[PDB]
Swiss-Prot record, chains A, B, C:
Compartments it resides in: Cell surface; Cell outer membrane
Complete-protein stretch covered: 333 to 422 of 422
Subunit record text: Homotrimer; trimers are very stable, not disrupted by heating at 95 degrees Celsius for 10 minutes in SDS sample buffer.
Family, per entry: Belongs to the autotransporter-2 (AT-2) (TC 1.B.40) family.
Protein name per UniProt: Adhesin YadA
Note: Expression of mutant proteins in E.coli is improved in a degP deletion, suggesting the mutants are susceptible to degradation in the periplasm.
Gene Ontology terms describing biological process: cell adhesion; protein transport
Residue ranges of the TM segments: 52-62, 66-77, 84-90, 94-105
Keywords assigned by UniProt, alphabetized: Cell adhesion, Cell outer membrane, Coiled coil, Membrane, Plasmid, Protein transport, Signal, Transmembrane, Transmembrane beta strand, Transport, Virulence
Origin species: Yersinia enterocolitica serotype O:8 / biotype 1B (strain NCTC 13174 / 8081)
Its biological purpose: Collagen-binding outer membrane protein forming a fibrillar matrix on the bacterial cell surface and phagocytosis resistance. Promotes initial attachment and invasion of eukaryotic cells. Also protects the bacteria by being responsible for agglutination, serum resistance and complement inactivation. Gly-72 plays an important role in this protein; replacing it with increasingly large polar residues decreases expression levels and trimer stability.
Translocator domain: region residues: 52-105
Domain of life: Bacteria
GO cellular component: cell outer membrane; cell surface
Domain-level remarks: The signal peptide, cleaved at the inner membrane, guides the autotransporter protein to the periplasmic space. Then, insertion of the trimerized C-terminal translocator domain in the outer membrane forms a hydrophilic pore for the translocation of the passenger domain to the bacterial cell surface. The passenger domain is probably exported as a hairpin structure, with all 3 strands of the trimer in the pore simultaneously.
Gene encoding the protein: yadA
Length: 105, 105, 105
């Protein structure tokens, strides 16, 4: 039983199975921790005004116990239609890209 | 050992256990990939102005290697109080709903 | 086989291994459900205007089949530079913090 809490070794091949599963779960949670932190940072922008010019959006964020840096840019044309798109950098292999559009009803 | 990398079969019933766990993990990660993509797309809006009318917010996004479509709408009354709410459609069984409010301090 | 669907018990110690893994997966998905709901709620704000004052941002959200409450606040100085930062409360042990900045290009 390894030390006490873990206790991966179970059978002739249960130790490798338990370790593999435990490693996969930790990897999923990690991607969500950093992935959410970066995504939020990007979704935390909104471009300050924009009657017909370009605006730079960027910022950092954090989730649970992780941190990520997100960036982006969009062009705010007129006061009726809009558009925003940027990329977020989380951890190492956790990258995401956004692209939405705002409109007045 | 299946092919080489996988190697699900372990014992008399380890093959089914390893496959079930591997399938569950992949399903969790998937929901996060599309779920985050859609959520972000919705959170990437902000409604262009709004002194006392309605605004339509919609857009698409992507995370890691997935894509989702999000939509929403809110009424921007006055220049002090606000409100935004919309729904996001990710994958197939990945739907989320938002509803927040902005205020000037 | 427990009841039918579950069927955790497999070997002399497979029941405990299957239960532990199944419990971990459910815990990961949970953190993502509430974590995404709260994060979105916070990222669903944008501060209504701000030429040189403070703005309070807060709201709730939901993902899949969960609900969370998020809050935050930032100071909107001038009509070129900006900043937003807040904290989101999800479930019980699912807390996140954001902090980004907007700028006109």
């Amino acid at each position: 039983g390894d030390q006490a809490s873990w206790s991966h070794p179970q059978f002739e091949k249960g130790a490798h199975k338990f370790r593999q599963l435990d490693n996969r779960l930790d990897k999923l949670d990690t991607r969500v921790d950093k992935g959410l932190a970066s995504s939020a940072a990007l979704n935390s922008l909104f471009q300050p005004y924009g009657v017909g010019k370009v605006n730079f959006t960027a910022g950092v964020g954090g989730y649970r116990s992780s941190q990520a840096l997100a960036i982006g840019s969009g062009y705010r044309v007129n006061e009726s239609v809009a558009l925003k798109a940027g990329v977020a950098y989380a951890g190492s292999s956790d990258v995401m890209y956004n692209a939405s559009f705002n409109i007045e009803w």
